[PDB]
């Protein structure tokens, strides 16, 4: 829609500037290397990303086709316009009645064919020190140049993300015991410690807990999915696999503090890695 | 989410320089304009059981600043700060609108109700500086509103 | 009739009650179909007392009129009169009804209450008891065979005899202690010891009569006391299971399941992906921390009180993401009332 | 020690620019967002025998700042600071999440419970500057939490 | 609006350097001149029904600053701060006009009524700086007016 | 979400918005204080140990109001000048905390039979940017709080 | 008695008639100082913020009804709101305001009883 | 080619004390009863502006 | 901090009100209306648990 | 638009602009305070419950003025030195809040029969940049407020 | 240099947190999101080895 | 870089080499070798160079840290680089990537 690419900015700089510059000069888009024509030579010199105009955009959705939209970036284009020609030396130059209708085109176009851009027309940024370096890289020939800055959004690549909208929502609230996952985890440690130097053995195992919803709970009976991770000695990993396996399918829970009865669905144990 | 269901064109924020200010019944070209803020100051009530209550309070009086160069001719900002006798001062509306590129469409404007001047500075009469002689005027008012169109 | 601009005098005896409502008590005063005193509108809304005596300008004595009049004099906002054969139609249509009160009504309100509970509208019913006196040789399993065995109802035996002499159905006394408790202490506190003013029970209940009706189907006596007079005395539903005993914890999970349902319907048409499962999980979590803070849950950390899970391998499947279904499973611990205070005395220090 | 027992891949911290903010029930594109701090203030008790007792105290109220450019159209931050009568203000949730590169995965988010506005500045209406017109809004809330996923 | 009904020529503000200052009965060439401000200080009266009353108050005394290089010859700014005995000081008019390019037309001027000196600094006698020795004098007066011609 | 109709029910009330109904007229005041309800104390002790503590009789409130001096007619001078040795027009004072529009009462402090006992002039100072504020003090018999 | 010569429900009561005389005239004398402006969209703004500033001084001193300024008045002036392009080109600015005023309490009915 | 103003009409008419906010949020549960319907019309908005209503 | 268990308590036996002060109304103040009641009793007891 | 002729009608008056007419002459003062109107209180209680509250008799005002010491003739010493055991020239005090030009009264506080009871010397201090200020206190019988 | 020898260390005894800032969520800066935590403790010692 | 703590192995008992992370700083041009139209051959190639950069804020090296096109260069600074090329100006696109590089490996 509004995403104008970078060739679309050069074509926007030729429609705005043909209308004021005389019909038989030229509009050129490089630096000249016997030129035999005047050729004002619009020249682009950096395309850095404009940080000051980006926001915290949130990657919009479609919800009719169910697809995420590509989240653009917006760069700044930085042209500069000269007048190569190739005596003329009068106050009414041929070289300055062309540069009088170049800036008259810029002055009138603070809003291009790209009507949703953001333009700085002729900023004060350059200096005789800085112009003196550019006049050497041309090959030691100074001119009168007019800088002109434009930012524009450029969209990302397009692939089918294909998320789906929500359209329905289920909420089920069940009673639980007043155990924290902290009160559960630190009860399974000295529950396990008695299940076995054992305090030295299971020092670096951690066994974080998260309470499963327990579809028909009670005021007691919290139900918990474990994941055990960490480090243990060589010999102790084998007896701990039995006390994990009886917790997973146990008739009467596991260690329960003061009648709560914590239950376990999955021991997991992927990361124990006994040395 | 940007759930518009179709691609929406991007907008850039409109620049500071393209604005327009009318004191009231006339339009004046200024250089700068600041301090048009809506400010509340909160009221709190902490409680022993532990519920904090946070509320807005009164809305504070704005302190608007306006600056402008010194021109040959009639000083219209002095003829309004001259005419004060002890509480008598002619209050005025202020509107600082924010136009488009051509200036023929107001986009967002800030409205100020009874602004009277409190100060008016002199320029910095510095002989060693090739620079415009500006002067600031500071207003005080009672409310600031925003209308968008 | 007002004619001239002065000050007028009259002595027509009128009454008017103020409104001190709570949003979690919007009842449904179901009345019998065998009644010609009522206006033939099948469903009608009564936002305050000064509108109820426009439709019914003369004081009746019938069971729908001593039920509403004992409602509005304890605060009470909007509330409904529906025929006993239309309460399933009105629960499904007004979306804020939190109570069904059988104002002297049975044998089909008991039926159509069981209709809307299976459809899951999160309603709490308030029923009646026997109108003539239970003997004492009653064998309580023969009296509460009539009543549903759902956890969403309670029964409240002793009928009312308010000051004009007329009868009050005891679903209105028990709904009058819910206006003054949801206003004052919240929906999680039991509606029992709140005093309902301007009514007296028809009969009298000794402590040894209530003791056999306490466990089982829980007949929920209305008893007078010196001090807190004519309170309701008992706060149990029609099921003695260890999670849906106690009237207040049931209404505490009605209002939780409905305030999360009305706060998260404003998240439909979002993408059913991982940023949505976050702003679900922080919208539920912000609500229950406002609820834990005002003394409604148990445990002294927010990890002690609730949990919530929503996501990819937690509670849903890829078969259910692609057809839309968001499943949000919450578990939360509520408080219990102290029902029995055992004083054991001695002689030694 | 980095005792993972095998080589662990390195992580770099995620940049400030890729974030996302929703006031509550809508998503708003901002430019800056600051001041979402958990702050306690200590309580002390020095003793004659010499044991110092240091404790946390209350947790202080946050003062969040949000800035955004001024766009043509409806000012959604003004319609929420306009609608105040003396303590009445509609509180809102704030979530400032911090996504990955594509933006389809929330990584860390900061949750704010009852934020109401206290101020809303005007832009700096400076005619001598080719620059975006921004405006800051300052909120006050009661708690800030972090959830990680 | 610029409703003059025909095109009006543009004006640029006149520079700071082309000014002219006379203490009173003589013309003195200075380098800088500052602080010629009209300043009021407000009086307020808030009310229970809610109407705020905002008014000007007294107009504050100006504190003018003037600087000048140190020349060989008579110090005319010292002979006016020397001649003080305990309240006796010879007050003077100050006019700081603001001329055109040739200097033969006063455009805007600032008039000061009874200015007496309060301070007179020494130069910064720094041996490591190839720089003019200046000295500031600070005046206090009672009113400042502007006349335009 | 706090939904500001709930702020009008369960948040407290500030003290900067109030209407003073003075007899049958509304007069704008700046400050208002001293609308207290104070009792005395009766005590009785015997030799056995019984202390008997009782409320006494409540004494008179002293209400002080203050408003600014306006160029028109001084209504508070015209009510303290009409004293003839006993004879004063008693008035009913109503000081109501109001909404921001000014049209409905949140909570009110009523004062039954008030009459002026003092009226202070403003303090004239040539070096001060202040408003001329008169301060009247009243004496009554009863303070009533109506809440609605 | 404070009634006019017409018992219609908007122009009964003498005060609400004089309240709309002075509104219609204080907006007519405050907006004639905006003639010879261009009849375009910046003018329709500074009309709409000059009417709105006057009525907020009027709502604040207890002259309108409703407890928000959205409850009290509205104003519309513009292109498709109240004018046409046939009327912009011949000059005509039409500014249509609507505002709610208060009513007096005319009858105070005291109804006494015997029971408490 | 804009035109000057040269004439100005002002007409002030009585209105009800409804805000456009009080109007819009009454049309939502007015519509909601006109129909899961709360889930349906969640993301419709229906802003209001009061027409002058000539009499 | 949860509000559910007593650390130390100060008990007061037979209290009755002797005064009740109105808030100080000021049009230039952002404060909350605070009533202050004073009580008179016979015994102060400290229970610690 | 506030149109400053309306400020002269409905805005309050500050306290920095005042003219003191002292007998038949105008004397420039810096401060002026104490022009109060104070009454006493009569009370009467019976056993049935009737409290009777009444204004007493108004007591004398004590007005204090202060001005600076000027090199000429001291007019306030010449009026407190002419005391012979009873005999003092009583004067009429008029303290009028005035416009900025000084030519018309906004509101005035009149004082009937004032005579000096004290006159304080300035506090001499070698380390102070202040003006020598005498402070005279007056005693009268009536305070009148005329508004025009 | 290798990190296998501690040279000088600073020891802190009972440090608890008092604050935890958020990052500066600035969209106009290609920069790491940091967060500071401020601790309060009771003594600091130095051991050298 | 942080205060990393030189991780251990504890199964083979060996200290792991503690890396460093350097920043690489590419810049992309277009040499070619008239074309002079707004739809250049030289700029429809530099339109698909930055389109590759814009899409790749995260490379095949998915654990890098990239600045895509920073605003850092200047016409003074570009004017020096355009001379060291031999006095021929072009349009360049800078692109910054950091990446960890591990130390040498010996058996600790």
PDB file of N, CA, C and O in Angstrom, chain A residues 2 53 58-62 69 72 74 110-111 116 118 153, chain B residues 1-3 5-10 12-13 15 17-18 101:
ATOM      1  N   UNK A   2       1.370   1.611   1.178  1.00  0.00           N
ATOM      2  CA  UNK A   2       2.185   2.804   1.331  1.00  0.00           C
ATOM      3  C   UNK A   2       3.675   2.505   1.241  1.00  0.00           C
ATOM      4  O   UNK A   2       4.485   3.435   1.273  1.00  0.00           O
ATOM      5  N   UNK A  53      12.534   7.881  13.624  1.00  0.00           N
ATOM      6  CA  UNK A  53      11.151   7.751  13.206  1.00  0.00           C
ATOM      7  C   UNK A  53      10.574   6.366  13.425  1.00  0.00           C
ATOM      8  O   UNK A  53       9.418   6.134  13.058  1.00  0.00           O
ATOM      9  N   UNK A  58       3.668  -3.335  16.453  1.00  0.00           N
ATOM     10  CA  UNK A  58       3.278  -4.589  17.076  1.00  0.00           C
ATOM     11  C   UNK A  58       2.889  -5.684  16.090  1.00  0.00           C
ATOM     12  O   UNK A  58       2.153  -6.584  16.489  1.00  0.00           O
ATOM     13  N   UNK A  59       3.357  -5.635  14.835  1.00  0.00           N
ATOM     14  CA  UNK A  59       3.334  -6.767  13.892  1.00  0.00           C
ATOM     15  C   UNK A  59       1.902  -7.243  13.606  1.00  0.00           C
ATOM     16  O   UNK A  59       1.414  -8.228  14.161  1.00  0.00           O
ATOM     17  N   UNK A  60       1.209  -6.436  12.806  1.00  0.00           N
ATOM     18  CA  UNK A  60      -0.227  -6.586  12.640  1.00  0.00           C
ATOM     19  C   UNK A  60      -0.645  -7.880  11.970  1.00  0.00           C
ATOM     20  O   UNK A  60       0.097  -8.517  11.230  1.00  0.00           O
ATOM     21  N   UNK A  61      -1.897  -8.234  12.233  1.00  0.00           N
ATOM     22  CA  UNK A  61      -2.530  -9.505  11.925  1.00  0.00           C
ATOM     23  C   UNK A  61      -3.533  -9.264  10.801  1.00  0.00           C
ATOM     24  O   UNK A  61      -3.739  -8.130  10.379  1.00  0.00           O
ATOM     25  N   UNK A  62      -4.127 -10.324  10.257  1.00  0.00           N
ATOM     26  CA  UNK A  62      -5.104 -10.139   9.188  1.00  0.00           C
ATOM     27  C   UNK A  62      -6.524 -10.487   9.622  1.00  0.00           C
ATOM     28  O   UNK A  62      -7.450  -9.717   9.352  1.00  0.00           O
ATOM     29  N   UNK A  69       1.373  -9.791   8.886  1.00  0.00           N
ATOM     30  CA  UNK A  69       1.784  -8.749   7.955  1.00  0.00           C
ATOM     31  C   UNK A  69       3.244  -8.373   8.196  1.00  0.00           C
ATOM     32  O   UNK A  69       3.680  -8.299   9.345  1.00  0.00           O
ATOM     33  N   UNK A  72       7.713  -3.316   8.602  1.00  0.00           N
ATOM     34  CA  UNK A  72       8.614  -2.611   7.701  1.00  0.00           C
ATOM     35  C   UNK A  72       9.813  -1.997   8.424  1.00  0.00           C
ATOM     36  O   UNK A  72       9.954  -2.059   9.646  1.00  0.00           O
ATOM     37  N   UNK A  74      12.268   1.858   7.771  1.00  0.00           N
ATOM     38  CA  UNK A  74      12.206   3.128   7.061  1.00  0.00           C
ATOM     39  C   UNK A  74      13.562   3.818   7.045  1.00  0.00           C
ATOM     40  O   UNK A  74      14.057   4.266   8.082  1.00  0.00           O
ATOM     41  N   UNK A 110       7.969  20.045  -0.703  1.00  0.00           N
ATOM     42  CA  UNK A 110       8.154  19.516   0.643  1.00  0.00           C
ATOM     43  C   UNK A 110       7.292  18.296   0.897  1.00  0.00           C
ATOM     44  O   UNK A 110       7.190  17.852   2.043  1.00  0.00           O
ATOM     45  N   UNK A 111       6.642  17.777  -0.142  1.00  0.00           N
ATOM     46  CA  UNK A 111       5.773  16.610  -0.047  1.00  0.00           C
ATOM     47  C   UNK A 111       5.658  16.081  -1.467  1.00  0.00           C
ATOM     48  O   UNK A 111       5.058  16.739  -2.319  1.00  0.00           O
ATOM     49  N   UNK A 116       3.361  10.329   1.698  1.00  0.00           N
ATOM     50  CA  UNK A 116       3.535   9.928   3.079  1.00  0.00           C
ATOM     51  C   UNK A 116       4.983   9.771   3.498  1.00  0.00           C
ATOM     52  O   UNK A 116       5.311   8.891   4.298  1.00  0.00           O
ATOM     53  N   UNK A 118       8.835  11.828   4.673  1.00  0.00           N
ATOM     54  CA  UNK A 118       9.222  12.851   5.639  1.00  0.00           C
ATOM     55  C   UNK A 118      10.511  13.474   5.128  1.00  0.00           C
ATOM     56  O   UNK A 118      11.549  12.814   5.117  1.00  0.00           O
ATOM     57  N   UNK A 153       9.164   4.274   3.936  1.00  0.00           N
ATOM     58  CA  UNK A 153       9.149   2.897   4.437  1.00  0.00           C
ATOM     59  C   UNK A 153       9.382   1.884   3.330  1.00  0.00           C
ATOM     60  O   UNK A 153       8.914   2.045   2.205  1.00  0.00           O
TER      61      UNK A 153
ATOM     62  N   UNK B   1      -2.861  -5.404  19.129  1.00  0.00           N
ATOM     63  CA  UNK B   1      -2.309  -5.881  17.873  1.00  0.00           C
ATOM     64  C   UNK B   1      -2.775  -4.920  16.801  1.00  0.00           C
ATOM     65  O   UNK B   1      -3.828  -4.302  16.941  1.00  0.00           O
ATOM     66  N   UNK B   2      -2.053  -4.879  15.691  1.00  0.00           N
ATOM     67  CA  UNK B   2      -2.462  -4.034  14.594  1.00  0.00           C
ATOM     68  C   UNK B   2      -3.499  -4.843  13.833  1.00  0.00           C
ATOM     69  O   UNK B   2      -3.282  -5.228  12.689  1.00  0.00           O
ATOM     70  N   UNK B   3      -4.632  -5.101  14.481  1.00  0.00           N
ATOM     71  CA  UNK B   3      -5.699  -5.886  13.873  1.00  0.00           C
ATOM     72  C   UNK B   3      -6.682  -5.065  13.050  1.00  0.00           C
ATOM     73  O   UNK B   3      -7.856  -4.960  13.401  1.00  0.00           O
ATOM     74  N   UNK B   5      -7.190  -5.816   9.900  1.00  0.00           N
ATOM     75  CA  UNK B   5      -7.562  -6.902   8.967  1.00  0.00           C
ATOM     76  C   UNK B   5      -7.088  -6.728   7.513  1.00  0.00           C
ATOM     77  O   UNK B   5      -7.343  -7.576   6.661  1.00  0.00           O
ATOM     78  N   UNK B   6      -6.366  -5.639   7.264  1.00  0.00           N
ATOM     79  CA  UNK B   6      -5.795  -5.322   5.961  1.00  0.00           C
ATOM     80  C   UNK B   6      -4.653  -4.333   6.189  1.00  0.00           C
ATOM     81  O   UNK B   6      -4.585  -3.694   7.231  1.00  0.00           O
ATOM     82  N   UNK B   7      -3.777  -4.180   5.208  1.00  0.00           N
ATOM     83  CA  UNK B   7      -2.601  -3.333   5.373  1.00  0.00           C
ATOM     84  C   UNK B   7      -2.985  -1.865   5.527  1.00  0.00           C
ATOM     85  O   UNK B   7      -3.723  -1.303   4.713  1.00  0.00           O
ATOM     86  N   UNK B   8      -2.462  -1.245   6.577  1.00  0.00           N
ATOM     87  CA  UNK B   8      -2.701   0.156   6.859  1.00  0.00           C
ATOM     88  C   UNK B   8      -1.439   0.955   6.554  1.00  0.00           C
ATOM     89  O   UNK B   8      -0.327   0.560   6.894  1.00  0.00           O
ATOM     90  N   UNK B   9      -1.619   2.085   5.863  1.00  0.00           N
ATOM     91  CA  UNK B   9      -0.552   3.002   5.489  1.00  0.00           C
ATOM     92  C   UNK B   9       0.117   3.574   6.729  1.00  0.00           C
ATOM     93  O   UNK B   9      -0.535   3.767   7.759  1.00  0.00           O
ATOM     94  N   UNK B  10       1.422   3.830   6.632  1.00  0.00           N
ATOM     95  CA  UNK B  10       2.162   4.309   7.786  1.00  0.00           C
ATOM     96  C   UNK B  10       2.061   5.827   7.865  1.00  0.00           C
ATOM     97  O   UNK B  10       1.838   6.520   6.862  1.00  0.00           O
ATOM     98  N   UNK B  12       3.837   9.344   9.555  1.00  0.00           N
ATOM     99  CA  UNK B  12       4.909   9.900  10.350  1.00  0.00           C
ATOM    100  C   UNK B  12       4.401  11.098  11.139  1.00  0.00           C
ATOM    101  O   UNK B  12       3.472  11.779  10.702  1.00  0.00           O
ATOM    102  N   UNK B  13       4.962  11.350  12.320  1.00  0.00           N
ATOM    103  CA  UNK B  13       4.531  12.510  13.104  1.00  0.00           C
ATOM    104  C   UNK B  13       4.892  13.821  12.435  1.00  0.00           C
ATOM    105  O   UNK B  13       5.910  13.937  11.752  1.00  0.00           O
ATOM    106  N   UNK B  15       5.965  17.727  11.802  1.00  0.00           N
ATOM    107  CA  UNK B  15       7.119  18.424  12.382  1.00  0.00           C
ATOM    108  C   UNK B  15       6.736  19.596  13.268  1.00  0.00           C
ATOM    109  O   UNK B  15       5.626  20.123  13.221  1.00  0.00           O
ATOM    110  N   UNK B  17       8.006  22.629  13.161  1.00  0.00           N
ATOM    111  CA  UNK B  17       8.126  23.974  12.618  1.00  0.00           C
ATOM    112  C   UNK B  17       6.836  24.466  11.990  1.00  0.00           C
ATOM    113  O   UNK B  17       6.574  25.670  12.001  1.00  0.00           O
ATOM    114  N   UNK B  18       6.032  23.570  11.424  1.00  0.00           N
ATOM    115  CA  UNK B  18       4.804  23.992  10.757  1.00  0.00           C
ATOM    116  C   UNK B  18       3.689  24.131  11.790  1.00  0.00           C
ATOM    117  O   UNK B  18       2.844  23.260  11.986  1.00  0.00           O
ATOM    118  N   UNK B 101       1.418  20.634   5.235  1.00  0.00           N
ATOM    119  CA  UNK B 101       2.519  21.238   4.486  1.00  0.00           C
ATOM    120  C   UNK B 101       2.107  22.561   3.858  1.00  0.00           C
ATOM    121  O   UNK B 101       2.836  23.554   3.953  1.00  0.00           O
TER     122      UNK B 101
END
